[PDB]
From a paper:
In this study, we report on the identification of a distinct class of sirtuins (SirTMs) found primarily in pathogenic microorganisms and show that these function as protein ADP-ribosyl transferases. Members of this sirtuin class are genetically linked to a specific subclass of macrodomain proteins, which reverse the sirtuin catalyzed ADP-ribosylation. Moreover, we show that in Staphylococcus aureus and Streptococcus pyogenes the sirtuin-mediated ADP-ribosylation is dependent on another posttranslational modification—lipoylation.
To gain further insight into the SirTM catalyzed ADP-ribosylation, we determined the crystal structure of SpySirTM, both in the ligand-free form as well as bound to ADPr or NAD+. The overall fold for these three structures is identical with a low root-mean-square deviation (RMSD) (0.29–0.31 Å). The models contain residues 3–292 (residues 7–10 are not visible in the electron density maps) and follow a typical sirtuin fold comprised of a large Rossmann fold and a small bipartite zinc coordinating domain. No major conformational changes are observed upon binding of either ADPr or NAD+, with the exception of slight readjustment of the loop region between β6 and α14 as well as following β7. The most surprising difference is the replacement of the absolutely conserved HG motif containing the catalytic H residue by QG. In accordance with the functional analysis, our sequence and structural analysis revealed the absence of a catalytic histidine residue, crucial for the proposed deacylase mechanism and found in all other hitherto described sirtuins and that may explain the apparent absence of deacylation activity in SirTMs.
Author numbering: 3 to 6, 11 to 292
Write the structure that this text describes.
Amino acid sequence: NWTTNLTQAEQLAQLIKEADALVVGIGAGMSAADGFTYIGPRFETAFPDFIAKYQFLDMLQASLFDFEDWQEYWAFQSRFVALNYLDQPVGQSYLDLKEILETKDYHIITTNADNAFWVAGYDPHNIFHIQGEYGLWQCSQHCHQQTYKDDTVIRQMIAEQKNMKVPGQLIPHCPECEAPFEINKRNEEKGMVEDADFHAQKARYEAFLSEHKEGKVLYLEIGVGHTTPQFIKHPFWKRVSENPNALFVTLNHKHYRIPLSIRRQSLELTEHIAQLISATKTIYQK
Ligand SMILES: [Zn+2]
């Protein structure tokens, strides 16, 4: 039962059923498993101009790049926001996971910033977007702690850009200091704008953790890579260490070495995330 000859799906369905609570951490692998990829034809088709100019390898590298000027920044980012936030369709793995989680006491933390939880109909009170969202903007000088949005301006930038530049008059500026807006994103050097809504999410996530310091708590980590381990992977390892009755189950095909203090509490499930979540749902619902 509560331990880390069954298939991966069978094992995962058994653990979720037996769990007292789930703390679910979701990264980029879950969206890639549903087809929302950041390398290969999806990127090449969407950004052939930028790829030819800069030799970008992938769409995540491109989204972090320090572009030539704000006209170029917004030409790239407007198209990036439409692809990954305004028009990205619902993912089946998100729907399948939701059907499982709605039977459980759970909370989600994600380093993703796409629309996936919203088009799949998740309750925003149960999700912490710790790395912001592509649909939001912040002052580029971080001059005050408020986020903004304007999807109509995004569509105008897509329609009116030419030659990798938005017209200068379309660039949006902060009302407080007149610096250009930028996408709400976290930088190592500058941090992120963290407004009232961000803190309300963080408080809900911290309250759920405080209620589940004991018991059969399943720390379920889905598609979380190496990029920013301080937000999900490392804190999950620490929570599992601190609660000897917790379990760490990671859906991943890279075999990151688990800390000694959680070796007896850890399981790696390597099967393709979409197919694994689908198979687990079918077992779980009977
Ligand atoms: Zn400002």
